[PDB]
């Protein structure tokens, strides 16, 4: 479950709650996905999970208030290309990748701003690699 979001190893993981490495072919081939460059990972991360994506967005402009720079995201989902698209359409300097932005989303999500701190807190509990982010 902590792998299932924000680890980039879900497709490489032999077990997805009991699931082998597939699902990537067909529906993505029926209509080609216009994204690439770790397109699998954003299908998995908490900012890329459609229901949890907007919860990060609700965190995002709370983080934006925390960072004192306000700007509206293009979509309710946060991933690699959308953040680049959001960049190319006014914000803090020093971060330009989605890896650190998801970090700043998650630590604020680990604050009692939404009742779904439980997911963010559990992610930082395991593993020890995620513990240092908190």
């Amino acid at each position: 479950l902590t792998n299932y979001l924000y680890r980039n190893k879900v497709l490489s993981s032999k077990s997805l709650f009991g699931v082998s490495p597939d699902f990537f072919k067909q529906i993505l081939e029926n209509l080609y996905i216009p994204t690439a460059d770790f397109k699998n990972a954003k299908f998995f991360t908490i900012t890329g999970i459609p229901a949890l994506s907007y919860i990060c967005i609700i965190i995002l402009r709370r983080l934006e208030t925390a960072e004192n720079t306000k700007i509206k995201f293009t979509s309710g989902i946060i991933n690699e290309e959308t953040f680049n698209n959001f960049f190319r359409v006014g914000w803090i300097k020093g971060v330009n990748n989605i890896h650190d932005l998801r970090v700043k989303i998650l630590m604020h999500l680990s604050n009692t701003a939404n009742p779904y701190r439980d997911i963010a807190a559990f992610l930082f509990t395991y593993l020890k690699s995620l513990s240092k982010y908190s």
């Binding site: 072919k25 067909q26 529906i27 029926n30 209509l31």
Partner: peptide
């Protein structure tokens, strides 16, 4: 796009109606 599932799936079924516009139009009505 003729198959909603893998080629190993479409072996049991048949995408002939999706491939053929005549059957595609006949099935709609």
């Amino acid at each position: 796009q003729h198959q909603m599932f893998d080629p190993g799936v479409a072996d049991l079924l048949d995408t002939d109606i999706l491939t053929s516009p005549s059957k595609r139009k006949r099935k709609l009505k």
